Write a protein that binds this ligand. Structure first.
Ligand SMILES: [Cl-]
Ligand SMILES: [Cl-]
Ligand SMILES: [Cl-]
Ligand SMILES: [Cl-]
Ligand SMILES: [Mg+2]
Ligand SMILES: [Mg+2]
Ligand SMILES: [Mg+2]
Ligand SMILES: [Mg+2]
Ligand SMILES: [Mg+2]
Ligand SMILES: [Mg+2]
Ligand SMILES: [Mg+2]
Ligand SMILES: [Mg+2]
Ligand SMILES: [Mg+2]
Ligand SMILES: [Mg+2]
Ligand SMILES: [Mg+2]
Ligand SMILES: [Mg+2]
Ligand SMILES: [Mg+2]
Ligand SMILES: [Mg+2]
Ligand SMILES: [Mg+2]
Ligand SMILES: [Mg+2]
Ligand SMILES: [Mg+2]
Ligand SMILES: [Mg+2]
Ligand SMILES: [Mg+2]
Ligand SMILES: [Mg+2]
Ligand SMILES: [Mg+2]
Ligand SMILES: [Mg+2]
Ligand SMILES: [Mg+2]
Ligand SMILES: [Mg+2]
Ligand SMILES: [Mg+2]
Lengths: 174, 174, 174, 174
């Protein structure tokens, strides 16, 4: 075993690997959304950039799990990064609904990891999860829900003017 | 009697206490409106913040009446702060209509106090009311009426796009 | 259920509401202490201001629980804010003893919430409590105990000179 | 009559003259207190300076009534400035008690003037009194009461150490 390893479950090590993959998967989904909104026949650039920035932050979160793995004396084991579920994302509302789901799926996996860490008696891991993942997740989920509520208020999917306005007012101008 | 007390009616003292309570009540109502607009299924954050700021200013007004009471040699007597009338506020229009009412109710109580102070021959109190409460009240009431007129113009309650736009343009961006 | 809601107990939601109320209650108690010490026949202004600042920080803590509630997809439910236990607070020693009790009561409720969150398996809530409430509570309680010890050393309640000196040296000059 | 005179009672004019004299009288009393506390066998210099500053502000208030008189088209009529009641002021407590009385006497005369102005229907005078005299009076009276309470707490008249400490902590260091 690694000379650094202490109080670090095989089970925890494997779960960190799975989480690293899920973050890469989430990043790739968001990249796809970026590319969709950047199409000439979609053309909602602030929306596009929102998703591009989400992609980057999920990739950074993946990197943090690689660093964590090594700090604990586990071994990073990579798997294929699955392509996103969809090739095209419909409109801002559908994309945000998919993002909410994705964030919930990522959160569930993080909470699952936290439960394992709790059962395993792994306090450093629990703290890591709380500090670096769980709060920022809650905020993300809140933000996306807020957005969904606004998109519905604006009359999506039918109301194109409403969609236009969301891109100008709700998301940062890029 | 307090060594500082001069020209200060029991009636005035009691009325200042009642006003202190009413300001706390108004503050708490506005807090509730803040919380409503911050819900994920409401999500009008600039509106939310407008009400949060109104809550803070009403609490400061309460504090000013405590200071006044003591400066005159009366005694602050606190009562329960009643919870707001509603748990949920409908939409921006309904909330602003409730705010107009509340501000009118607070103003009526302030004008009632001013009349008592006038009848009692209490000039320092009259001046305090004029200087610190009555003008800022008139302005508040004007502002909220203006807002109601705009919300009606925007097609509330039905027009969600209009509601969206009010939150972006009429209230300060938070 | 709210579209944002995930891993958030009815029990947790209700407990957050109760805590929001308790913080408002604590704020109101401290306001009363401020007003007492500001009386012309009490006149310990730095003491007064200590309590005024405690009142403000408890109100901010209430606001943080409203924000939390909404971030998780629970619903803020407000109740009356009960008036404080006493209308008058005796002297600096009695007031600080009451403050210690109040802080202990608030801490017990926070620890009770943490236990529920723990039993419920709610890690984000546990972290919130630790980060935003429990440490700052411990410090508050320590500070007030320190003060009580000093007030006893100074000869309170009988030693008015000692009380005078506490207001000049122990609490920040306002 | 003066070419400027409008809505200005003989009664108001005379009352302004009386008030001008009373302010000069109050100034002179405070001067005497300054001189007392500056004696080598009293030697409470911050106390002394407090009273010196009160003397100056009462003289400025006298000057403001001269300016007012002329602005309205009345005529300043001066009378002797009576010497203070006492040649020696005992100690800080006795002096502050005398100051409270004096401030109350000045306030009563100001309130009496305000009543006359009210009965006479003289709104500019009423406003002047409110704005320049009545609030600053209330504050003065509050401050002195606060001080009296502290001096009693400190054990005056007997407790010389308490008197010493008041001069260092309660009044501005000069
Ligand atoms: Cl597809
Ligand atoms: Cl309701
Ligand atoms: Cl009591
Ligand atoms: Cl004498
Ligand atoms: Mg080795
Ligand atoms: Mg496949
Ligand atoms: Mg495949
Ligand atoms: Mg994440
Ligand atoms: Mg984030
Ligand atoms: Mg996220
Ligand atoms: Mg008394
Ligand atoms: Mg009721
Ligand atoms: Mg009720
Ligand atoms: Mg007001
Ligand atoms: Mg205002
Ligand atoms: Mg108002
Ligand atoms: Mg829904
Ligand atoms: Mg009760
Ligand atoms: Mg009760
Ligand atoms: Mg823990
Ligand atoms: Mg707290
Ligand atoms: Mg604290
Ligand atoms: Mg505390
Ligand atoms: Mg002429
Ligand atoms: Mg004589
Ligand atoms: Mg004589
Ligand atoms: Mg004066
Ligand atoms: Mg003054
Ligand atoms: Mg004065």
């Amino acid at each position: 075993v690694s000379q650094v390893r202490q109080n670090y479950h095989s089970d925890c090590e494997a779960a960190v690997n799975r989480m690293l993959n899920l973050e890469l998967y989430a990043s790739y989904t968001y990249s796809s959304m970026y590319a969709f909104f950047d199409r000439d026949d979609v053309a909602l650039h602030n929306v596009a950039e929102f998703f591009k920035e989400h992609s980057h932050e999920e990739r950074e979160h993946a990197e943090k799990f690689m660093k964590y793995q090594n700090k604990r004396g586990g071994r990073v084991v990579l798997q294929d990064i699955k392509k996103p579920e969809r090739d095209e994302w419909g409109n801002t509302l559908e994309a945000m609904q998919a993002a909410l789901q994705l964030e919930k799926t990522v959160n569930q996996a993080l909470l699952d990891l936290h439960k394992l860490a709790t059962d395993k008696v792994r306090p450093h891991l629990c703290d890591f999860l709380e500090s670096e993942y769980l709060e920022e997740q809650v905020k993300d989920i809140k933000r996306i829900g807020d957005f969904i509520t606004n998109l519905k208020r604006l009359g999506l999917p039918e109301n194109g003017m409403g969609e236009y306005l969301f891109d100008k007012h709700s998301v940062k101008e890029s």
